[PDB]
Every structure is written in C-alpha cells, then in structure tokens.
Ligand binder design. Structure first.
Ligand SMILES: N#CCC1C=CC(=Nc2nc(Nc3cc(C4CC4)[nH]n3)c3ccccc3n2)C=C1
Length: 307
C-alpha cells in the first residue's frame, strides 16, 4: 500500500508498529530492506540515554550471541526538530517479561533462558584485553530486569538496553551516571538506602541482585514446581503492586528485608532446589555475599547436569 520509504544509511526502511518504552521513548518494529529490525526513537530530552547506549555499543567486543545486536544509530531531522534513532535486531518473541506473562516454561526451557542470560551478563561484566577492535572494559548494565532480556526464537536470551550502562577502566574511578537510576522494583537494598560512590564490584553486585529477581520470575512460572503454576507477577508485585514508590520499596526490601517467595514445593525437583539456592545467594542483603554472573552461569550448568 505504501511506496514511500524512510532511509537509513541509504537503505529503505518502513515502520510497521510501535511499542512503548522508558523515558518517553518508543521502539518500532520496522522492515529494513528485507529484514525486521527494532528502531528505538528517543526524544531529544533523553539524548543522554541515546548517547550512552551508542557509546556502549561502540566499545570493543560488543557483539555477542547474548547481547542484543546493534545495527546503528543516528541523529535525524533538522537542527530544530531532532529525533535520535538507535536500531537493533528485532526478536518476535519479545522480552522475557512478556513471554512469562503469556507462557509457562519447562525446566529445560528455564535452564536455557537462565544460562544464556547469565552468559550475556558475565560477558558484559568481563574486562577483555586483546580484541582486534581494542580492550573491552567491564560494563555494568544498571537496569537488569526481565523486560530488558529479549528472547530469540529458540528462547536464547540476550541482554538489551544499555542506556544506563557504565563502563569501568582499570585506570580510573566509576564515571558519571548523570543522576539516572534503574527500575525501583529491582534495586538492591544499598541502592534503595541511597549509598553512593559505588565502585566496579559494587555496580556488578547491584546487577546480580536484580538478576536474582529475574531468576525468581523464571522459577515462578516453571512447570517443574511440584504444584500449581500461578499467573505471572512481577517481583514484589504481590507485596507492593504494579506501581510502587521508592518509599514502598525501601520499606519492603531495606526495612523488612523481604524477597519474593521461594515456595518449598518448588524444591522437590533437585534442579529447582538448586535454582532456589542460587536465587537466594544472588539477592542476599550483603552485596559482598552475592554470586558473580560467571559463577551463576556455572551453577546453571550444574542444575542442568543433575536435573
Ligand atoms: N530496550 C529495551 C527493552 C524493551 C522495550 C520494548 C519492548 N517491546 C517489545 N519488543 C519486541 N521485540 C523487540 C524489541 C527489541 C529492541 C529492544 C527494543 N527487539 N526486539 C516485541 C516483539 C513482539 C511483540 C511485542 C514486542 N514488544 C521489549 C523490550
């Protein structure tokens, strides 16, 4: 019906349909040449996030099976009417959040999602000298959550949305976060308490806490439970609902030291029991006690091996 195209790097593109996301941005499913892609469009007010994600994707070694594939970024329009675009791969199965809303997962489905997710995050967090494009720094994501995990057609996970991500150079202290913070629900207690001047290992432990919560989401919709699988709920939603204040979260996580419920009947299955243990270690109130992404990946391999 439409013979008119937009153009990106001289290639024709058509917009198909939109989905909302953070900072009043949006993401379109689009067709670039003969493939579907995702075109993220940021208002000029969220230029910082656009620039940050572009910079992150421009770091050495940022191409990985478990990292949402970057296609390109540009400023579009006039001096006065500016749009910011960042294009990535499109995944028809969407985010793990939307997936879990509509589907339960078998034990083997759960392990594959967990393992590929942990791999992506372990790789993000890893400092790697010696790449052809340079030295990859450790990178903290800073907004880990099921909505920022996308699923490929075989349920392979990839980590998405680097608008808040922060690199660390062995040379210096942690750089400018520009006052931007993550999704309240998934914030570690020390973030909720307003502890400041975090350094590398602290940012990584913040991601691992949020990752614990995502692993809980998987567990909560897994058929390996020896019992019913309830309808999907977000972490802490049972306790503080779908739209909590910072004060709601502080009360529930810092003050009451509470976490999403790990049911005993989830632990008959030997794998699940081990999953539950891993979750508990990831979301420990003590950041220093939390498991690294690499260690979590190993744990997931073990659960599988035993089953
Ligand atoms: N960045 C980031 C997080 C995000 C933002 C919006 C989002 N919505 C969404 N995303 C997708 N898929 C998708 C989104 C992206 C890209 C991360 C914007 N790549 N693929 C679908 C696919 C099919 C039905 C519904 C979908 N909804 C899914 C994840």
């Amino acid at each position: 019906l439409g013979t008119e195209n937009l153009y990106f790097q001289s290639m024709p593109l058509q917009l198909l349909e939109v989905k909302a996301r953070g900072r009043f941005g949006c993401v379109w499913k689009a067709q670039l040449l003969n493939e579907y892609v995702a075109v993220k469009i940021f208002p000029i007010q969220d230029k910082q996030s656009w620039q940050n994600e572009y910079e992150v994707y421009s770091l050495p070694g940022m191409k990985h099976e478990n990292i949402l594939q970057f296609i390109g970024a540009e400023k579009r329009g006039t001096s006065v009417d500016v749009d910011l675009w960042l294009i990535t791969a499109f995944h028809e199965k969407g985010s793990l959040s939307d997936f879990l809303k509509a589907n339960v997962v078998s034990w083997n489905e759960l392990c594959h999602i967990a393992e590929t997710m942990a791999r992506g995050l372990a790789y993000l967090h890893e400092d790697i000298p010696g790449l052809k494009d340079g030295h990859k720094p450790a990178i903290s994501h800073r907004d880990i959550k099921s909505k920022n995990v996308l699923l490929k057609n075989n349920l392979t996970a990839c980590i998405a949305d680097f608008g808040l991500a922060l690199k660390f150079e062995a040379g210096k202290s942690a750089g400018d976060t520009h006052g931007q913070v993550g999704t309240r629900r998934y914030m570690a207690p020390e973030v909720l308490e307003g502890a400041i001047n975090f350094q590398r290992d602290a940012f990584l432990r913040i991601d691992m806490y949020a990752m614990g919560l995502v692993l809980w989401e998987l567990a909560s919709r897994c058929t390996a439970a020896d019992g019913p699988v309830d309808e999907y709920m977000l972490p802490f939603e049972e306790e503080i609902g779908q739209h909590p204040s910072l004060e709601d979260m502080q009360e529930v996580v810092v003050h009451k030291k509470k976490r999403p419920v790990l049911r005993d009947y989830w632990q008959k299955h030997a794998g699940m029991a081990m999953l539950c243990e891993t979750i508990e270690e990831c979301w420990d109130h003590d950041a220093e006690a939390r498991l690294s992404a690499g260690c979590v990946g190993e744990r997931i391999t073990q659960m599988q091996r035993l089953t």
